[PDB]
Amino acid sequence: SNFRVQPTESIVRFPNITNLCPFGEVFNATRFASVYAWNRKRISNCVADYSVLYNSASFSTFKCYGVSPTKLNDLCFTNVYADSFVIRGDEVRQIAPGQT
Amino acid sequence: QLSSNFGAISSVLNDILSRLDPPEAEVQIDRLITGRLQSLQTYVTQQLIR
Numbered sequence: 296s297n298f299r300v301q302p303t304e305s306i307v308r309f310p311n312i313t314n315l316c317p318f319g320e321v322f323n324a325t326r327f328a329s330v331y332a333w334n335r336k337r338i339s340n341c342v343a344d345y346s347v348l349y350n351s352a353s354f355s356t357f358k359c360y361g362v363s364p365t366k367l368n369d370l371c372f373t374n375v376y377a378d379s380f381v382i383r384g385d386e387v388r389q390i391a392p393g394q395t
Numbered sequence: 396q397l398s399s400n401f402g403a404i405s406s407v408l409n410d411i412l413s414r415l416d417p418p419e420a421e422v423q424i425d426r427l428i429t430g431r432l433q434s435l436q437t438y439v440t441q442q443l444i445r
Contacts, residue, residue, distance in 0.1 A: 361404075362415065363414070365416075366414065370413075370414065
């Protein structure tokens with residue numbers, strides 16, 4: 296067989312960042328941008344909590360592409376984008392990569 | 396040869412493993428598995444001839 300040294304003790308390293316992102320201002324925005332003029336903003340230097348958003352029952356659909364939603368509170372990024380727009384009628388499901 | 400993609404989204408295993416559910420990560424792991432197995436087989440055959 297083979298001989299492998301197991302780790303002695305597990306350590307956890309994540310900073311003590313404090314400030315919270317203003318996610319309530321975009322989810323409860325007074326007026327939303329149009330589809331042909333969709334607003335795009337950049338958020339950084341803040342803690343984003345996706346557990347409250349995922350656990351919320353006020354949403355209709357929550358689909359994540361490329362990354363699982365349950366591991367979004369542990370990973371770290373460099374920047375994020377918030378695209379806000381309103382579309383009515385059918386063709387709602389077409390908002391996804393690789394669609395026509 | 397360990398840094399090639401072979402079609403997956405990332406060439407390293409820990410990034411894909413710790414970022415996605417295993418039900419989806421199965422495909423990404425399988426591509427790397429088959430590529431690395433082929434590389435090892437080629438190496439062994441060359442060594443035998445030499």
